[PDB]
Structure 1
Amino acid sequence: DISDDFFALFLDPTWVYTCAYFERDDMTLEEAQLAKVDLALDKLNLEPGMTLLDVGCGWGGALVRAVEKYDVNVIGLTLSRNHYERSKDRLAAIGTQRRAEARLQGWEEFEENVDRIVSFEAFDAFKKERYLTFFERSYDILPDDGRMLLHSLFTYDRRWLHEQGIALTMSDLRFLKFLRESIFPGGELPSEPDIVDNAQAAGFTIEHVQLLQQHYARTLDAWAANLQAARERAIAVQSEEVYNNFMHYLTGCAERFRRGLINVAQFTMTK
């Protein structure tokens, strides 16, 4: 696995490794990551004491913000031990009377009632055979007035891209191979209908779709600039091969968000 010490060289202090939201053009990376979390959590209409489930909680940045700003009980799920350990430690260091727990557990095994669900860039890594099952389970554990904010990457097919004046280049195919054949996201993404049609089949209404395509291009630019500035320490923690691979991933994904080849969006999902 890639060490937390490597990610610490280019992530902001929230340890959020998903698309930020530069709500104001002059926000720092940290302010834009908190704005992204707040943007999602505001759509859930949280009241203090509600229980929020975070599917794919990462290193705990969103849950920590959820407790601190919104005063909710939180459950975070992750299958990554490095993610679980940091989430566990950070939530315990919060001074709160609320429940704040991280679990080394997949959503497929989680069956408690919660009031609201949020998920940042976990869905686009699910198997397509689990798309509907995820929304059926999400629907089932939410109350009658429950809400879910699904933040997810998705891709476009050749024909839609052509209608938008975009074509995939040989360079784009070589990058697509490098994704699947290495350890990075973006390979085998869902389409937008994969999200919308399965969510609606499970009974959800799509209240709102907010695209963040160019916010991700800026986020990836910032991670790449941070990593370049810390290149020597990055190579010491890992290796030159890993540094160059990460730099190829970050700049290559930023380029393809700017070109419009893929997208990222927050789907406000109601019952």
Structure 2
Amino acid sequence: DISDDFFALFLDPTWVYTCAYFERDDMTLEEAQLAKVDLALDKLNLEPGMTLLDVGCGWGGALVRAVEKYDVNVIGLTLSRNHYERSKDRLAAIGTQRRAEARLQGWEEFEENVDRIVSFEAFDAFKKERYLTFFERSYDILPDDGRMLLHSLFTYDRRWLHEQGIALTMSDLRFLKFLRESIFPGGELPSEPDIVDNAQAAGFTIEHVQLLQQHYARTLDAWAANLQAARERAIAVQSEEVYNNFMHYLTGCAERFRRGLINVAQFTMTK
């Protein structure tokens, strides 16, 4: 796949690779990623010593933030070995008496009780045949007053787009195919009902939905600006083909968030 050394060229030091939250207009990318993590974690009412599960933990930035700021025990799951390795190393380098572990393990295999769950843009990598199963499992491992913050992309169909004044162009269709044909997220996104209806069928209440559509446009712009500024190094680490593909993905996604063709939101999920 793609080396960490490539992503290092355009991500901030948290390594967070999901929609940031520019809670103040003048935050840096790193401040906005920490703000996004805190925005989610604040909704979980974490007390020191609870155990937080991060489903799809990436390179571990949210787990690290959870330990440092919220003083919780943490378990992170990922299917990526590179994500696991960096999460493992970063968590072991935190000085904490709490338990902090990363695992190369799917949520499908995880059955331990935890106090709270967070997940940032893992849900779109799940097969649609697992949407309900995911919420059922999440419900089962939470306590009676547990909470889950699901941060997920989602898409709109033609009918909804049109009522909002938006059309899918021939270009957008080719872009979707480009996303599916390469190694990028966004080709098989859930609908909002896919999230909400399956979560409710599993027993969750949707307490709050916070849309972050334009924050993702800004996030993607920043990643693209960073990658372009490091173009020579990116080509050296991977290739010009990969570099141009990533720039197409970053700028193309940014355009479509700005246009409103897709969205991203934090769903506060209670029992």
> How would you bin the TM-score normalised by the shorter chain?
over 0.9
Identity %: 100
In the TM superposition, residue 231 of structure 1 has moved relative to its aligned partner by: 0.2
**TM-score (structure 1 length as normaliser):** 1.00
Distance in 1 of aligned mates of 2:107 and 2:173: 32
Distance in 1 of aligned mates of 2:243 and 2:262: 24
In the TM superposition, residue 232 of structure 1 has moved relative to its aligned partner by: 0.3
Describe the SS at the equivalent of 2:76: strand
Q: Deviations over 1:125-156 (max 9, x none)?
A: 11000000000000000000000000000000
Q: Deviations over 1:21-72 (max 9, x none)?
A: 0000000000000000000000000000000000000000000000000000
In the TM superposition, residue 213 of structure 1 has moved relative to its aligned partner by: 0.2
Describe the SS at the equivalent of 2:167: coil
Distance in 2 of aligned mates of 1:229 and 1:161: 35
In the TM superposition, residue 118 of structure 1 has moved relative to its aligned partner by: 0.1
In the TM superposition, residue 117 of structure 1 has moved relative to its aligned partner by: 0.1
Distance in 2 of aligned mates of 1:150 and 1:14: 19
Gaps of 5+ in 2: none
In the TM superposition, residue 188 of structure 1 has moved relative to its aligned partner by: 1.2
User: Match for residue 196 of structure 2?
Assistant: 196
In the TM superposition, residue 124 of structure 1 has moved relative to its aligned partner by: 1.0
Superposed structure 1 runs of 4+ greater than 6 Å apart: none
User: Match for residue 145 of structure 1?
Assistant: 145
Describe the SS at the equivalent of 2:148: strand
The alignment of Structure 1 onto Structure 2 pairs a total of residues equal to 271
Describe the SS at the equivalent of 2:214: helix
Describe the SS at the equivalent of 2:217: helix
Q: Deviations over 1:90-147 (max 9, x none)?
A: 0000000000000000000000000000000000111000000000000000000000
Gaps of 5+ in 1: none
Distance in 2 of aligned mates of 1:167 and 1:74: 43
In the TM superposition, residue 264 of structure 1 has moved relative to its aligned partner by: 0.1
Describe the SS at the equivalent of 1:209: strand
Distance in 2 of aligned mates of 1:125 and 1:56: 9
RMSD: 0.3
Distance in 2 of aligned mates of 1:109 and 1:172: 36
Describe the SS at the equivalent of 2:54: strand
Distance in 2 of aligned mates of 1:81 and 1:231: 26
**TM-score (structure 2 length as normaliser):** 1.00
Distance in 2 of aligned mates of 1:248 and 1:108: 33
- Matching of residues 186-265 of structure 1 within 5 Å: 186-265=186-265
